């Protein structure tokens, strides 16, 4: 049937894009923009003002990496336009005039973000129709159940939202500004104690690779401190790009522990387990036992090994003992939002809900608050 | 060296296909097993009430 | 080509262990479901008993 | 109008349940597919 729509997930860290009705996205690439900083001397090599996405990752030695999205908010709109142009033309190779697009963004965001996103996707790319959805609702689509509380942790922001029988309670939505970038900065801070110093924006990606490869969530924090103090069995060795060898050891389970105790970063807010429990208790009495049995994890930050056991144990400790707590973590939970987007984008009954181009022309960019959510 | 590289990687793709099939069957019978697991509970409650 | 072959052999024999590591627990519940249903039958009899 | 302004009513959940299974079928069967080709390309 006719032409298929586009599904684009713009998290704070990495951008994902593909065609609707597909199982997995075609294009997955980091959301960075790089510009050179040194002198250029070789005459005739050609000029290149900006490096977008993956191309900036390979030549990151001579660039200053900059992130267009910060804490789930688009700060520099020009770099977002560059990223979207690169996604549409170099990664998917499709004309945007033929396809509708579905976008994702955080629960609690400023109004101007949505208004400017609608204005950009209509004015420049001339898309015929577009729509904005909350990422965690798409996670609940990806899971395939009608009832549950879903906690999504990205590179920019963490948020919990409960949904019961297709109805979402707006007052129980919790947003927390503790994500993967803060953990990367904390790892950069605690790697100083052993003598390794990373300062420039190029080494931030090295620290991120170290965090993705050699970090795990401890089941019991003090017992792991005792074990790491007693022996050297917890140390692991990593090789830098220049050939030096580093050995982390104790800091493997101290970086991801900071999610559960945000006082390590100086933040006053509670941990993710207490945030989920408080968001559950904000709901009504009758739906709480259903929310205990359908907790869904989403986002890349929850890909630490051992996060599920720690979360289940903490929520079991906080909740009354007479009920059962199960945490449903699919193995492909990184792309869950995008999968949900596909499931939403090609429903038969969803086709009446696109924001039409004529409606935008006759209403201005303010139409996105009346529709969407 | 080209020869054994080309053989080995398609062998790998066959074997990951097998892994996917068995993982899918596991997900089937586990999602069956939990509803059967609370079926027995409902049965026991009926018993105790009677 | 040779250095890529080394890595590819590592990957294939790691997954070769992993596949039947997954197979074992599947056929464990394949033999488990028998008692899990045969106990439910006796439980249903004890239900109608009361 | 304010409780369910954002969604249309009287929709069967079985349609969504069918579509999720249809998408999972491609993952199980490992289908080769290409994207939609443009008319201007044709």
């Amino acid at each position: 049937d006719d032409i298929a729509a586009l599904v684009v997930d713009n998290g704070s860290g990495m951008c994902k894009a593909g065609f609707a009705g597909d199982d997995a996205p075609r294009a997955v690439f980091p959301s960075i923009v790089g510009r050179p900083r040194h002198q250029g001397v070789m005459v005739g090599m050609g000029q290149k003002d900006s490096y977008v996405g993956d191309e900036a990752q390979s030549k990151r030695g001579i660039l200053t990496l900059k992130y267009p999205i910060e804490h789930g908010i688009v700060t520099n709109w020009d770099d977002m336009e560059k990223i979207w142009h690169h996604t549409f033309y170099n990664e998917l190779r499709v004309a945007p005039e033929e396809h509708p697009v579905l976008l994702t963004e955080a629960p609690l965001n400023p109004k101007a973000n949505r208004e400017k996103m609608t204005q950009i996707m209509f004015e420049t790319f001339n898309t015929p129709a577009m729509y904005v959805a909350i990422q965690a609702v798409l996670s609940l689509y990806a899971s395939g159940r009608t009832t549950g509380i879903v906690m999504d942790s990205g590179d920019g922001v963490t948020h919990t939202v409960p949904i019961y029988e297709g109805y979402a309670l707006p007052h129980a939505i919790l947003r927390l500004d503790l994500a993967g970038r803060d953990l990367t900065d904390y790892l950069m801070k605690i790697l100083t104690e052993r003598g390794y110093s990373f300062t420039t924006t190029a080494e931030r990606e090295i620290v991120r690779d170290i965090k993705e490869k050699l970090c795990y969530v401890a089941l019991d924090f003090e017992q792991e401190m005792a074990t790491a103090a007693s022996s050297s069995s917890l140390e692991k060795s990593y090789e830098l790009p220049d050939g030096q060898v580093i050995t982390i050891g104790n800091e493997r389970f101290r970086c991801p522990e900071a999610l559960f105790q945000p006082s390590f970063l100086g933040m006053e807010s509670c941990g993710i387990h207490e945030t989920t429990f408080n968001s559950i208790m904000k709901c009504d009495v009758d739906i709480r036992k259903d929310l205990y049995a359908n907790t869904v994890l989403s986002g890349g930050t929850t890909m630490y090994p051992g996060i599920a056991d720690r979360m289940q144990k903490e929520i079991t400790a906080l909740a009354p003992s007479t009920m059962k707590i199960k945490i449903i973590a699919p193995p492909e939970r990184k792309y869950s939002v995008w999968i949900g987007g596909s499931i939403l984008a090609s429903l038969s009954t969803f086709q009446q809900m696109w924001i039409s181009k004529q409606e935008y022309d006759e209403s201005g960019p303010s139409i996105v608050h009346r529709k969407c959510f | 060296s080209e020869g054994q590289v080309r053989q080995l990687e398609e062998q790998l793709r066959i074997m990951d296909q097998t892994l996917k099939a068995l993982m899918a069957a596991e997900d089937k019978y586990s999602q069956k097993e939990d509803k059967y697991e609370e079926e027995i509970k409902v049965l026991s409650d009926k018993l105790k009430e009677a | 080509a040779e250095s890529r072959c080394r890595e590819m052999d590592e990957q294939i024999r790691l997954m070769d262990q992993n596949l039947k590591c997954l197979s074992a627990a599947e056929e464990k519940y394949s033999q488990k479901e028998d008692k899990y249903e045969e106990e439910i039958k006796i439980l249903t009899d004890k239900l109608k008993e009361a | 109008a304010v409780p369910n302004l954002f969604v249309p009513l009287n929709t069967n959940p079985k349609e969504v349940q069918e579509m999720r299974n249809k998408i999972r079928e491609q993952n199980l069967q490992d289908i080769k597919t290409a994207g939609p080709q443009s008319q201007v390309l044709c």
Binding site: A24, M303, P331, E332, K334 | K20, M23 | - | D30, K32
Partner: peptide, 30 residues
């Protein structure tokens, strides 16, 4: 690591195969 291995399997097979097939078709047509 088993969850990590399954995520690696999904990302290596399903994400990459579709992109490679689309690249092949686009290259031949271009």
């Amino acid at each position: 690591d088993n969850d990590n291995s399954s995520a690696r399997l999904f990302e290596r097979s399903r994400i990459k195969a579709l992109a490679d097939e689309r690249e092949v078709v686009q290259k031949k047509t271009f």
